[PDB]
């Protein structure tokens, strides 16, 4: 349905989450570190992004140094033509860093 989120652990610090645009109007990321989502929680990370750049919708946080083995539990939201779509049950394990 909506694109699979690409999550990236940034070295030295941070997290990048993104999807490719397909004429969307909004992308939201909701994520928790090392703790499952209990329902549709706003999360530790929570932002609505309303401007795409370079054909993508990109969430960035530069506040967390992730550790190898850290897990992020998440959901996302996309608006297309006035209708909302969710990616549920997102789960990602930090296994490499990206510069």
């Amino acid at each position: 349905v909506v694109p699979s989120a690409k999550l990236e652990a940034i070295y030295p610090k941070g997290l990048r989450v993104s999807i490719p645009d397909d004429g969307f109007s909004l992308f939201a990321f909701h994520g928790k570190l090392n703790e499952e989502m209990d329902g549709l929680e706003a999360g530790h990370w929570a932002r609505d992004i309303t401007k795409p750049k370079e054909g993508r919708w990109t969430f960035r946080d530069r506040n967390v140094k992730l550790k190898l083995g850290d897990k992020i539990y998440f959901w996302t939201y996309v608006i297309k033509d006035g209708l909302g779509y969710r990616q549920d049950n997102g789960e990602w394990t930090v296994t490499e860093f990206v510069n």
Side-chain angles (χ1 to χ4, degrees), residues 8-15 33-34 45 63-72 92-97:
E8 300 171 273
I10 306 303
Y11 179 83
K13 279 208 91 171
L15 167 73
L33 174 64
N34 290 324
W45 299 282
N63 301 112
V64 182
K65 198 198 175 164
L66 294 163
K67 297 177 265 280
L68 291 168
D70 274 345
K71 297 186 87 185
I72 295 181
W92 176 71
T93 303
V94 184
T95 58
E96 63 185 293
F97 289 97

Side-chain angles (χ1 to χ4, degrees), residues 1-84:
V1 198
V2 291
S4 296
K6 174 188 197 152
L7 294 85
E8 300 171 273
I10 306 303
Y11 179 83
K13 279 208 91 171
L15 167 73
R16 189 161 61 202
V17 181
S18 62
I19 52 162
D21 197 20
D22 191 14
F24 309 140
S25 306
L26 178 142
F27 169 70
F29 178 70
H30 298 280
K32 289 172 81 183
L33 174 64
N34 290 324
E35 177 167 283
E36 292 206 78
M37 284 279 182
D38 299 300
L40 304 179
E41 287 170 316
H44 297 152
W45 299 282
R47 202 183 303 161
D48 290 2
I49 301 151
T50 181
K51 273 303 132 80
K53 299 254 172 286
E54 294 190 26
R56 301 184 69 74
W57 300 82
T58 305
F59 171 81
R60 294 174 182 88
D61 182 78
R62 313 198 170 76
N63 301 112
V64 182
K65 198 198 175 164
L66 294 163
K67 297 177 265 280
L68 291 168
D70 274 345
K71 297 186 87 185
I72 295 181
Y73 295 95
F74 68 93
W75 57 278
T76 66
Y77 197 56
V78 172
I79 299 292
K80 179 158 184 67
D81 305 324
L83 299 168

